[PDB]
Design a protein around this nucleic acid. Structure first.
Ligand SMILES: [Mg+2]
Ligand SMILES: [Mg+2]
Ligand SMILES: [Mg+2]
Ligand SMILES: [Mg+2]
Ligand SMILES: [Mg+2]
Ligand SMILES: [Mg+2]
Ligand SMILES: [Mg+2]
Ligand SMILES: [Mg+2]
Ligand SMILES: [Mg+2]
Ligand SMILES: [Mg+2]
Ligand SMILES: [Mg+2]
Ligand SMILES: [Mg+2]
Ligand SMILES: [Mg+2]
Ligand SMILES: [Mg+2]
Ligand SMILES: [Mg+2]
Lengths: 199, 142, 92, 84, 66, 91, 22, 125, 115
RNA sequence: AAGAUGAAAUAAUAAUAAUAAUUAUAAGACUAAUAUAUGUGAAAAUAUUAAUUAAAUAUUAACUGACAUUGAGGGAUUAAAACUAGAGUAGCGAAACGGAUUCGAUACCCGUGUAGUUCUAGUAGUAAACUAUGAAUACAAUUAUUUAUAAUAUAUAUAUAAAUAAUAAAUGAAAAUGAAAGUAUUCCACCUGAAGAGUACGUUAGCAAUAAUGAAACUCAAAACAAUAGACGGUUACAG
C-alpha cells in the first residue's frame, strides 16, 4: 500500500526534529541530518523534499526542519558543516567499548564520530608515525584553547609560551601552529575533549 | 557643635520656572539606640543658597526658558565657589522634568559647573508621583 | 552606641528609593545618562506628564486599548519583517 | 507569544535605517586632534597620524536599504492569509 | 464488562461517547509508524550519524528488492 | 588588545565552523541572546521579599508579562503575592 | 501553656537557625 | 480554619531584641489555646530592616523582629487576635491570611511551602 | 465543626436532609430530596441576607433558589401527589407557598418581616 | 520675587519674610506598576491588602425521569446627573464674582470658588444603559493563536473543549457578518414617510427635578442608509 511505502520512503527515514536552525549556544555534536544532492539534481533545484529549493543555493548540502510551513516556505539552512569536522577527526587518527558485546536515550560510546579502534600504528614512508601532528590555531590568552580541525582542544606547553603569543595578543588566532593531539575522550554531554600540546 | 556631613544641591524644574537650592546637612556628635538611628537616618538640613531665574533678572515667560535655567545654574555654581562650600561631598537631587532640567545638567557637567562636578557623589531623582491620590485639574480646551 | 554608629551606614543605605546613583568621577555625564535610562525605564516622565490633567476613565480605557494594540501590532510587524529577511536570505 | 497581524494594505518600513559607514578622514582628524590636545600641538608623537591624514584627505577632504522591496515582493507569500 | 483501572465499572455512556464524531470521518488521518519512534532513538544515540550526508532524491522505489 | 565585543570566544569541547571566526557570528550572537517558571505557586513567596524582588523594577514596579515571560496564571499569582507583600509591611 | 512555654523558649532564646531570608 | 500570622514586632531593647517577640508570641498563643485553638508553628524570621521608616502610633521604626505563627482557630477568635494585634504598641505591622484545608488537614507555613515542604510531616522527616 | 467554615456545617446539614428524604440509599435526585437540599441552602442564604441586607447579588441568588424549589415541588405534585403533600408538610411549607407566583419582592420582605 | 499664560492680568500671593527646600502635625479623597477588564458579574458594574459570609469551573460516580424553553402582566437590580435628612469636605468644580481675549465675549483661557463629587439611611428608574445585534435549541468548511482540562513518553508540532483573529460557503442595499447578520425551529419585544413630537392633554408614580404611558390637526414630496467619484480640510507622511 501507499502507507507502507511512505513509511519506508527517504523523507520518512529522516527523524522528526524541530531544534532551532540558528542555535547560538554550545555545539557539542550535530543536531540536524545533512541533506545532500547531486550536481544534476541541484541544477534543477531538486532535493527530494516537497518544494524546489531556491536557485540562490549553490551549495549541495543543507539542513531542514519543516518541508512546508504556513509561510509557504521550507525552513532550511544551506549548511553541511558538521561532516567536515567528523572527517577532519578521521584525518587526525586519534581514537576515542560499547560497540562490543525500556529504551535508553543516552549517547552510546562515541555517537558515531569515530569507529576506529585504539591500538594501531600509522606506517609512513619515513616510518611508523610515533605521534600525530596537526595544524591548529591558538585562540585566546588563558591550559590554553586551540581551534584544531573543527574542535576546540586544550593546549599544554613544554615549558612556556613563546614571545609570539603576547606579541600578537588577541590576534594570535591569525597564525597557524602545529600541535600533537595527546588524547581524545568524550564526556556525558556528548562533547569531545581533546588534549594536545603545542610544539 | 554643627558639623557638616554633606551638601545637597536640589533642583525643581517646573514648566514656568526653575528653583535651585543649596543646603548643608548638619550633624551633632553626642538618647536610645532607636533615637540615635532615627536621628542619623533623617539628618537635619539647612538651606544656604536659594535661587530662581527671577533672581538672575529674567521676567515672566523668560523665567521658564532654557537660557534662564542655564544662567541660574551658573550663578549657583559661582555662589557655591564664592561661599567656600566645596569642602564636603555634594548629593544632587532633581524633582521635575521642566525644560530647565537639561540646562542644569549641561551647566553642571560643563565648564560652568566644572568646579562643582568634581565633588558630587550621588545624583538622584525626587519626582513626586501620586498612586491615585487627588483629582487633577480638567484638561484645557485650547 | 559605637556599634550603633557602625550600623548607621548599612541601615541608611538600606532605605534606597532606587532612583539614586553614584556619579562616576571620570565622566559624570555617563552617570546622568544612567539616571535618565532609569527614568525612562520606570516611565517616570510619562507618569508625571499624564498626571498633569484628569482624564475620564472611559478615555483612559480606550487610550489603554489603543496603546496595547499598537504595541502588539509592532510586535507582529517585526515578526513579519524577520520572516521577510529570512526568506530573502534563503533566496525566496 | 506570536502576534499575527490582520490583512494589511502594505508591508513597508517607514524610514529604513542603513549602514552609514563612517568617513575615514573624520576619524583620522579626530584622532590627530586628540593627540594634539594630550601631547601638545605639532607633537612628534603622532606625526604618523598627520602623514596619514595628509595622505587620506589629499584629493578629497571627505575621502540604501532594500527591505521595502523584498517585503512588498514577499508579503502575499508569507502573510499566512487563508485561501480564497 | 470489567472494572477499569480505578476499579469502577462502566454502566452508562460518558459525555465523549454522546458527542457526534462525524468530523473524525473526514479529517485526513495522521499516518504513524513505529519506525519513526525508532528512527528518533538511533539519532539521539548517534548524533554524529546526522553528519553523514543523506540524499533524499529517490532513484526508484519499485526497483528495491531487499 | 581589542574590545571583547569585537572578539568571539569559542568555548571548550565545542565543534566550530570557519564562520565562527567572523563578525557575522558575533552579530548573530547579539541578535539571538526561573523559580516562578515552574510548578511553584508564586503566592507561597508573599513572605519572601528577596525572591519576588527579582520580578520588580529598581523603583518596585511589577514587570510586565512580556518581560517576566511567566504564564498568565503565574503572572497573576506573582502580582498578587507582590501586592500582598507590599501591604504586610515587607517589600 | 506548658507546650507553648517549651516551644517559645527553645525557638526564640537558643541561637537557632532562623528563617532569615538572604 | 488554619491561619498564618506574620507579625513585625518592635525592638526597643537593643541588647536583647528578641525579648518583645517572645512575649508577643506567648500572649497570642495563650489566647489561641485558651480559646479552643491550636498552634502549629511559631517559625521565627530574623531581625530585618523595614523597607521604610514605618510609624506605628506615635513612634517611628526603622527595623523590626519578623515572626510567623501558624495556628488553627475559629473565625471569631481569629478576628479577636487581629484586633489585639492592631491595638498593641509592640506590633508595627500584622497580617493574618487563611491557609485552605479543603485538600489537606496538614499544611506547612508559606515559607516552608515555598521551600518545597508542603506539609509539616515532610518538615519533620 | 465549631472551628470550621460554615460551608462545612451546611454540607453536613445537606447530608442529614438527604438521608431523611431519600427513597433509598444513594437517592440524591428525587424531587423530595432536591427540595430538602434546596431548603437547607435556602435557610443558610436567608440567614446571610438577614445579616447583609444590601447584598443584592445573593438576594437574587436566594430568590432564584426559592423559585427553583418551587418548580421542583410543583413537578412533584404533578408526579406523586402523596409524596408531594408529605414533603411540603415535613419542610414547613403549604400548598399555596408552592403553587403561587413568588417574586421575593419588597412587599414580601415587609409583610413577613424578613429583616 | 512668586504663580499663571499664547502673552498678561486678576477686588483676597510675598518684606506681616513669601515661593522653593527640610522636618513635624492634621484632614479628606484616591488606588502607580502588574494590565489584557485577561477575567468575574444578569446588566449596571468590577483590578491597593486581609478576613467572614454567599455565589460562580471541569470531569467522573450515583440519582430523578422531560421536572424543559420562552415569557404578556408582574418583580428585582440598575451609570452619571438630581432630590430629602444627617455627617464630611483635602483636591476637582456647574453657578456666581472678577482678570484676559475680542469689533463685540454673553465663550473657549486665568483666579476665588457655592452646589456636587465622599460616607450613612432613602427617593428616583433614566444613558450612545452599545456588540447601536433579545433568549433558547439543532446544524454547517478551514486555518492560526492562546485559554482550560485529559493523557502519552521538553517530545508526541499531542487529543478534547471555550474564547480570540483571518476566512470558505451562505447571507446581505452594501459596509460587512461568519459560527451569526448562515441553514432551521420556538417564544417574547419592537417598526411601518419627514415634520409636528417623545410634544400637548389626561392618567399613574415620585418630596421635587421628573419618569412612564402617548395623540391629533396643520405642511410637504420628501426623508434616510450603504457605497461611488470628486471638491474641500486651521488633514498625515514622503520626495523632489
Ligand atoms: Mg425553572
Ligand atoms: Mg493599577
Ligand atoms: Mg425566563
Ligand atoms: Mg463608571
Ligand atoms: Mg448623588
Ligand atoms: Mg445633605
Ligand atoms: Mg467639597
Ligand atoms: Mg480650580
Ligand atoms: Mg464659539
Ligand atoms: Mg472658571
Ligand atoms: Mg430603589
Ligand atoms: Mg429622560
Ligand atoms: Mg430609553
Ligand atoms: Mg439586514
Ligand atoms: Mg414626559
Amino acid at each position: 500500500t501507499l502507507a507502507e511505502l511512505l513509511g519506508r520512503s527517504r523523507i520518512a527515514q529522516v527523524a522528526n526534529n524541530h531544534k532551532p536552525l540558528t542555535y547560538t549556544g554550545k555545539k557539542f555534536h550535530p543536531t540536524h541530518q545533512i541533506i545532500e544532492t547531486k550536481p544534476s539534481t541541484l541544477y534543477r533545484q531538486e532535493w527530494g523534499l516537497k518544494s524546489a529549493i531556491p536557485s540562490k543555493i549553490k551549495s549541495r548540502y543543507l539542513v531542514y526542519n519543516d518541508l512546508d510551513t504556513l509561510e509557504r516556505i521550507t525552513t532550511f539552512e544551506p549548511r553541511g558543516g558538521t561532516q567536515w569536522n567528523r572527517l577532519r577527526f578521521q584525518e587526525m587518527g586519534v581514537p576515542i567499548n560499547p560497540f562490543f558485546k525500556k529504551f535508553n536515550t543516552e549517547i552510546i560510546g562515541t555517537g558515531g564520530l569515530s569507529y576506529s579502534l585504539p591500538g594501531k600504528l600509522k606506517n609512513s614512508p619515513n616510518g611508523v608515525i610515533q605521534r600525530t601532528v596537526v595544524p591548529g590555531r591558538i585562540l585566546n590568552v588563558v591550559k590554553w584553547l586551540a581551534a584544531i580541525g573543527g574542535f576546540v582542544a586544550d593546549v599544554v606547553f613544554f615549558q612556556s609560551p613563546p614571545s609570539s603569543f603576547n606579541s600578537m595578543g588577541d590576534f594570535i588566532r591569525m597564525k597557524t601552529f602545529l600541535f600533537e593531539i595527546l588524547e581524545a575522550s568524550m564526556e556525558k554531554n556528548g562533547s569531545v575533549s581533546m588534549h594536545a600540546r603545542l610544539l | 557643635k554643627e558639623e557638616v556631613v554633606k551638601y545637597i544641591l536640589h533642583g525643581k524644574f517646573t514648566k514656568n520656572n526653575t528653583h535651585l537650592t543649596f543646603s548643608s546637612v548638619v550633624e551633632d556628635k553626642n538618647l536610645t539606640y532607636n533615637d540615635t538611628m532615627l536621628y542619623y537616618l533623617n539628618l537635619p538640613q539647612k538651606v544656604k543658597i536659594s535661587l530662581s531665574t527671577g533672581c538672575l533678572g529674567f521676567r515672566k515667560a523668560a523665567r521658564g526658558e532654557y537660557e534662564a535655567a542655564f544662567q541660574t545654574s551658573g550663578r549657583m555654581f559661582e555662589l557655591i565657589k564664592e561661599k567656600n562650600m566645596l569642602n564636603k561631598d555634594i548629593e544632587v537631587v532633581m524633582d521635575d522634568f521642566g525644560k530647565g532640567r537639561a540646562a542644569f545638567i549641561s551647566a553642571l557637567v560643563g565648564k560652568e559647573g566644572a568646579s562643582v562636578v568634581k565633588k558630587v557623589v550621588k545624583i538622584s531623582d525626587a519626582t513626586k508621583l501620586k498612586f491615585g491620590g487627588v483629582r487633577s485639574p480638567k484638561m484645557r480646551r485650547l | 552606641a559605637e556599634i550603633a554608629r557602625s550600623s548607621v551606614e548599612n541601615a541608611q543605605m538600606r532605605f534606597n528609593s532606587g532612583k539614586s546613583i553614584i556619579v562616576n568621577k571620570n565622566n559624570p555625564a555617563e552617570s546622568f545618562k544612567r539616571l535618565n535610562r532609569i527614568m525612562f525605564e520606570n516611565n517616570i516622565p510619562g507618569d508625571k506628564r499624564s498626571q498633569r490633567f484628569y482624564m475620564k476613565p472611559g478615555k483612559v480605557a480606550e487610550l489603554k486599548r489603543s496603546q496595547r494594540h499598537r504595541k502588539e501590532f509592532m510586535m507582529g510587524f517585526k515578526r513579519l519583517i524577520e520572516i521577510v529577511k529570512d526568506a530573502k536570505r534563503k533566496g525566496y | 507569544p506570536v502576534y499575527r497581524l490582520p490583512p494589511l494594505p502594505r508591508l513597508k518600513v517607514k524610514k529604513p535605517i542603513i549602514r552609514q559607514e563612517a568617513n575615514k578622514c573624520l576619524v583620522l582628524m579626530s584622532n590627530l586632534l586628540q593627540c594634539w590636545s594630550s601631547y601638545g600641538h605639532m607633537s612628534p608623537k603622532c606625526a604618523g597620524l598627520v602623514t596619514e591624514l595628509k595622505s587620506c584627505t589629499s584629493e578629497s577632504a571627505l575621502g540604501k536599504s532594500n527591505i521595502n522591496y523584498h517585503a512588498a515582493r514577499l508579503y502575499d507569500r508569507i502573510n499566512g492569509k487563508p485561501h480564497d | 464488562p470489567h472494572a477499569n483501572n480505578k476499579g469502577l465499572y462502566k454502566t452508562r455512556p460518558n459525555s465523549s461517547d454522546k458527542r457526534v464524531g462525524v468530523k473524525r470521518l473526514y479529517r485526513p488521518p495522521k499516518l504513524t509508524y513505529v519506525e519513526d519512534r525508532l528512527r528518533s532513538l538511533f539519532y539521539k544515540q548517534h548524533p554524529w550519524e546526522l553528519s553523514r550526508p543523506k540524499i533524499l532524491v529517490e532513484n526508484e522505489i519499485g526497483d528495491e528488492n531487499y | 588588545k581589542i574590545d571583547q565585543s569585537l572578539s568571539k570566544k569559542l568555548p571548550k569541547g565545542t565543534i566550530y565552523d570557519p564562520f565562527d571566526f567572523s563578525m557575522g557570528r558575533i552579530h548573530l550572537d547579539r541578535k539571538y541572546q526561573d523559580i516562578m517558571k515552574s510548578g511553584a505557586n508564586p503566592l507561597e513567596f508573599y513572605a519572601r521579599p528577596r525572591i519576588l524582588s527579582r520580578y520588580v523594577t529598581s523603583t518596585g514596579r511589577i514587570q510586565h508579562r512580556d518581560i517576566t515571560g511567566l504564564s498568565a496564571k503565574n503572572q497573576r499569582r506573582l502580582s498578587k503575592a507582590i501586592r500582598r507583600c507590599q501591604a504586610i509591611g515587607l517589600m | 501553656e506548658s507546650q507553648l512555654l517549651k516551644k517559645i523558649d527553645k525557638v526564640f532564646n537558643d541561637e537557632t537557625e532562623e528563617f532569615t531570608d538572604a | 480554619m488554619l491561619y498564618e500570622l506574620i507579625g513585625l514586632v518592635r525592638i526597643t531593647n537593643s541588647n536583647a531584641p528578641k525579648l518583645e517577640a517572645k512575649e508577643l508570641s506567648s500572649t497570642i498563643g495563650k489566647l489561641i489555646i485558651q480559646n479552643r485553638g491550636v498552634v502549629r508553628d511559631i517559625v521565627p524570621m530574623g531581625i530585618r530592616y523595614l523597607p521604610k521608616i514605618m510609624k506605628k502610633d506615635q513612634e517611628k521604626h526603622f527595623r523590626a523582629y519578623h515572626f510567623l505563627m501558624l495556628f488553627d482557630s475559629s473565625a471569631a477568635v481569629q478576628s479577636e487576635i487581629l484586633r489585639t494585634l492592631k491595638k498593641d504598641p509592640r506590633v508595627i505591622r500584622s497580617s493574618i491570611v487563611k491557609v485552605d484545608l479543603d485538600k489537606q488537614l496538614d499544611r506547612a507555613s508559606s515559607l516552608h511551602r515555598s521551600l518545597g515542604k508542603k506539609s509539616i510531616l515532610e518538615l519533620v522527616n | 465543626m465549631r472551628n470550621s467554615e460554615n460551608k462545612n456545617a451546611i454540607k453536613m446539614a445537606v447530608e442529614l436532609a438527604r438521608k431523611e428524604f431519600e427513597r433509598f440509599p444513594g437517592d440524591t435526585g428525587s424531587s423530595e430530596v432536591q427540595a430538602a437540599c434546596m431548603t437547607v441552602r435556602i435557610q443558610n442564604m436567608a440567614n446571610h441576607i438577614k445579616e447583609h441586607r444590601k447584598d443584592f447579588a445573593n438576594t437574587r441568588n436566594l430568590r432564584i433558589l426559592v423559585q427553583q424549589r418551587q418548580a421542583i415541588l410543583r413537578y412533584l405534585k404533578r408526579d406523586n401527589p402523596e409524596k408531594y403533600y408529605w414533603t411540603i408538610q415535613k419542610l414547613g411549607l403549604n400548598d399555596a407557598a408552592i403553587t403561587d407566583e413568588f417574586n421575593m419582592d419588597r412587599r414580601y420582605m415587609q409583610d413577613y418581616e424578613f429583616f
